[PDB]
Amino acid sequence: VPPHVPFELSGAELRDAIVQYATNPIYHDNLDWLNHDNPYRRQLRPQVLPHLDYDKVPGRENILNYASLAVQRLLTSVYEADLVFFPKSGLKGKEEDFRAFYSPANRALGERIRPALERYAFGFLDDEVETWTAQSLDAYLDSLEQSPVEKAILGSADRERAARMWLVQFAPDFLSEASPMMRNVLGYYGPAQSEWFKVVIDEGVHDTKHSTLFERTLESVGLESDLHRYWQYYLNSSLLLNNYFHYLGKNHELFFRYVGALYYTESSLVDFCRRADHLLREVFGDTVDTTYFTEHIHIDQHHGRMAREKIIKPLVEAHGDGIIPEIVRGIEEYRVLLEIGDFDFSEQIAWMDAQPELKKLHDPVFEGLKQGKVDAPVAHLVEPRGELSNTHCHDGDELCHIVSGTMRFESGLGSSLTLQAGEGVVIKRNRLHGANIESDECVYEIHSVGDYRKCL
Amino acid sequence: HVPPHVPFELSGAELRDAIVQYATNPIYHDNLDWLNHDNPYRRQLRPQVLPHLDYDKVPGRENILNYASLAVQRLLTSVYEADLVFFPKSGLKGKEEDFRAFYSPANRALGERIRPALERYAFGFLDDEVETWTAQSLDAYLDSLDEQSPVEKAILGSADRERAARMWLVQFAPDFLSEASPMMRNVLGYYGPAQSEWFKVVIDETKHSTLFERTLESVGLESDLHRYWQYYLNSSLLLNNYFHYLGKNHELFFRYVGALYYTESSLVDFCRRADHLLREVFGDTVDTTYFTEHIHIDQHHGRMAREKIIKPLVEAHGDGIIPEIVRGIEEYRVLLEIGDFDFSEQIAWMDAQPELKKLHDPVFEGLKQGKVDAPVAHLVEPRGELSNTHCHDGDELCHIVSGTMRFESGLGSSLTLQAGEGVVIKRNRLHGANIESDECVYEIHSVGDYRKCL
Numbered sequence A: 001v002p003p004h005v006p007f008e009l010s011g012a013e014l015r016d017a018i019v020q021y022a023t024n025p026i027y028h029d030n031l032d033w034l035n036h037d038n039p040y041r042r043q044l045r046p047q048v049l050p051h052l053d054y055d056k057v058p059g060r061e062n063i064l065n066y067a068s069l070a071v072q073r074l075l076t077s078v079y080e081a082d083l084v085f086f087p088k089s090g091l092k093g094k095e096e097d098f099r100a101f102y103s104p105a106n107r108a109l110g111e112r113i114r115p116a117l118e119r120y121a122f123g124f125l126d127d128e129v130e131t132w133t134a135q136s137l138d139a140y141l142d143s144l145e146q147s148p149v150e151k152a153i154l155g156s157a158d159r160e161r162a163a164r165m166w167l168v169q170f171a172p173d174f175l176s177e178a179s180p181m182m183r184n185v186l187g188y189y190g191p192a193q194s195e196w197f198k199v200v201i202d203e204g205v206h207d208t209k210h211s212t213l214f215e216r217t218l219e220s221v222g223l224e225s226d227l228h229r230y231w232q233y234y235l236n237s238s239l240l241l242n243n244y245f246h247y248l249g250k251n252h253e254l255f256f257r258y259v260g261a262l263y264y265t266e267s268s269l270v271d272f273c274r275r276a277d278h279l280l281r282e283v284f285g286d287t288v289d290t291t292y293f294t295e296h297i298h299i300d301q302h303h304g305r306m307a308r309e310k311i312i313k314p315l316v317e318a319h320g321d322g323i324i325p326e327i328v329r330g331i332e333e334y335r336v337l338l339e340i341g342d343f344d345f346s347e348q349i350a351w352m353d354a355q356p357e358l359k360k361l362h363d364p365v366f367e368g369l370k371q372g373k374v375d376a377p378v379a380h381l382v383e384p385r386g387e388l389s390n391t392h393c394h395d396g397d398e399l400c401h402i403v404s405g406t407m408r409f410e411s412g413l414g415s416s417l418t419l420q421a422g423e424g425v426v427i428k429r430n431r432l433h434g435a436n437i438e439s440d441e442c443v444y445e446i447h448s449v450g451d452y453r454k455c456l
Numbered sequence B: 001h002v003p004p005h006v007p008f009e010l011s012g013a014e015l016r017d018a019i020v021q022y023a024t025n026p027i028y029h030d031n032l033d034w035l036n037h038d039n040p041y042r043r044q045l046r047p048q049v050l051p052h053l054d055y056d057k058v059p060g061r062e063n064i065l066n067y068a069s070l071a072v073q074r075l076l077t078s079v080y081e082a083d084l085v086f087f088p089k090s091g092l093k094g095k096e097e098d099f100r101a102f103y104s105p106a107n108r109a110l111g112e113r114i115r116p117a118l119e120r121y122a123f124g125f126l127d128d129e130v131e132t133w134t135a136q137s138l139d140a141y142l143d144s145l146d147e148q149s150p151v152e153k154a155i156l157g158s159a160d161r162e163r164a165a166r167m168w169l170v171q172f173a174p175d176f177l178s179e180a181s182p183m184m185r186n187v188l189g190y191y192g193p194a195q196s197e198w199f200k201v202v203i204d205e206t207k208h209s210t211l212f213e214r215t216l217e218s219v220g221l222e223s224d225l226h227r228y229w230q231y232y233l234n235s236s237l238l239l240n241n242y243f244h245y246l247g248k249n250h251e252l253f254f255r256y257v258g259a260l261y262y263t264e265s266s267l268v269d270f271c272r273r274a275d276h277l278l279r280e281v282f283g284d285t286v287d288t289t290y291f292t293e294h295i296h297i298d299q300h301h302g303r304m305a306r307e308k309i310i311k312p313l314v315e316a317h318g319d320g321i322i323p324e325i326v327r328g329i330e331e332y333r334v335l336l337e338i339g340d341f342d343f344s345e346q347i348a349w350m351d352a353q354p355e356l357k358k359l360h361d362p363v364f365e366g367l368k369q370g371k372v373d374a375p376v377a378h379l380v381e382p383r384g385e386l387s388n389t390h391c392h393d394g395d396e397l398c399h400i401v402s403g404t405m406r407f408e409s410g411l412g413s414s415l416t417l418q419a420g421e422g423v424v425i426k427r428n429r430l431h432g433a434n435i436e437s438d439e440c441v442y443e444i445h446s447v448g449d450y451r452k453c454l
């Protein structure tokens, strides 16, 4: 038997493999803000990927940096090669893209880089979450206010816009509802397998399928339900939460983490749906369809009790107390990700609402640079009409200054500024944004100021 | 600027090395026993032979029961099954290291890198075995689809009916004990009304795996995966793997739609024959509930598949998908033919062991007359060196010089070979051996066609 060479992929070889995956034409920059009923095109900004360091895994303070957003986008695309999608309008005329996404090559290239991407995406959780007995576990589960999202949306300068931005964050999860969970039903194991399957079944009648109900919610507020129309408006943290469940479902060494996360999500579901129904009704009035959420507003309309009694209990008995720390870890990791999502979304809404003031704030920041309060690297850019900078973020504060021409500066769904000669905008660290050129040519500068407040 | 795309490429020595890399995980090394003992993480891939196979030369149908094809089928089963959840019947306690060796980032990535090449090797021949359509002509075709069956003939014609039937039943263990797992692969995602129709079929599969457990146990077999790994025929793995292939690779979704229609439409006849044959072989003691769940004509999802899956998909996605639907049906039918042949051949081979032990004498004598010039391998193996099951691409003569060998030809099919004895080993037939003396000295003569030595 030849010696086993352990799997290894790092450094330049890893960078090249990531670029190889992501340079498939279906991943190149979109010329528009939206994907138009084409579930095979996902914007991975492959031109930036050669310049990121995938070997240096970020901690929590840096997980909203651009490299993390880039990796979350990559991971979503890799996981979704296992999911079936067809366009709403049918496959006719989209066969080439279908075959580009579902190909032996696209799968193999993505699967080769998946281990490194998962370390980059989830490695920080090792430091955010810390032997057990059946006794300790029972106490723990037993021990488990206006929410951050409610505050963000209800306090917004534009409540309807803020709520629409919120709703599109759920498109990949709710429109493919239960897909990551279904990954745990394949195979051959104990009575717990049928219990898992029961939960999945709840999430074959198409009209009552929960994804169909969420389609109606989106359509009732003027949004569309084709995946991934709103790709460029998906926040880092939203992708992270969705990806976490594909991670747990695909990687069966993490099965017991999923068991924990299932218990916690089912136990929290009714409160989540009640709040969602209330908030949406307050924002949109009679016209919003909240049936997706009201399917679970009755106190017993969840699978939490069954998860504890028919999944956790039999698994601990069968497989021993060694699995308990994994159950707890799934719960605690998921709770960390929820915190990150609340922060990221709140920050994004504030950033969208502040655009007029951040356009004005360009003036004193630009003046500060002239006075030499900060010595800021400058990038000088010249871009033609319709060069659409697909959405991204930067790791420090940046000042965008227009020398000549006209730019549409995009900060969120329904959140835009028109920047003309001599105008600009303060771009806040980690905030999702993009731009398009509206004149024949636009000449502009990006100044890397670090902390814009030092220029004031 | 966007860097140029380097197309995915893996072939030649790099591919061989990658296959060996995957398969040298300790959980894949040769078993010291004939059976896996309630450990679903250990699968025998005979990694020591893998460096010497040519994965670039894709076999045609005449060669798909050759050893390289068996080796690739074993590899593919293991690669696909990393996506399936298994725990031991006795629980995970004491098997955690193997659990983590199978479900690891490395094991998955190594298997996925080689999956494209393995699938070309496994299924490439179908391109030449199966050859624009309209909704009209598809209807005519489906309408045109339809005497002991080959399996009935093989089992009821056997020298040992109970043994033949047990050998048959273990072939289904990976499929039936994980029932509907490959089909479940098609329900993930977001597509039309057909998604919910697919899901309904999956739901419809007491859970059926539990019923098959009872069938196995009623005839003295065990239901832990993969106890009987070394007795799984090439063709059985091929049939199971085909459905994981269709389910994992969504460019093949429409092939799966066709294969679903055909399997549902053939299910009742299959189950009726299985029930009758098992009752004849075993009498009152066999539990056939797994099969009698589907002995009623038209009580399958065939009509729904045609009206609620095929029809809406053709309307939505166009007539371009129709040839793929047909191809799934025709490919599956080819694989069934191969399975019928392979299983029939294996049962005949098991039943003929006493004659093939006697036939060693004239074949060995023929080699002395100078009838065939045959390459000879001279082997010396200690007690308990268990040659995990495999096959050869030509007929081989095994001759024992000294010591004692258990020569294994199938489940419950064994010969004891002593000094001066041996056996004719028929090409493509699954077999192995164990050494029962302190040392056994023996010879393998590559005779090609043993009949030329007579």
Ligand SMILES: CN/C(N)=[N+](/O)CCC[C@H](N)C(=O)[O-]
Pocket: A381, A383, A387, A388, A389, A390, A400, A434, A435, A446
């Ligand atoms: C308004 N521009 C901006 N925020 N940039 O980061 C520069 C964009 C540079 C280039 N068009 C791209 O998409 O990378």
Ligand SMILES: CN/C(N)=[N+](/O)CCC[C@H](N)C(=O)[O-]
Pocket: B385, B386, B387, B388, B398, B432, B433, B444
């Ligand atoms: C009875 N022996 C036999 N049929 N062989 O092919 C050779 C056995 C060679 C070696 N033990 C192996 O497992 O490959």
Ligand SMILES: [Fe+3]
Pocket: A392, A393, A394, A433
């Ligand atoms: Fe930018």
Ligand SMILES: [Fe+3]
Pocket: B390, B391, B392, B431
């Ligand atoms: Fe042999």
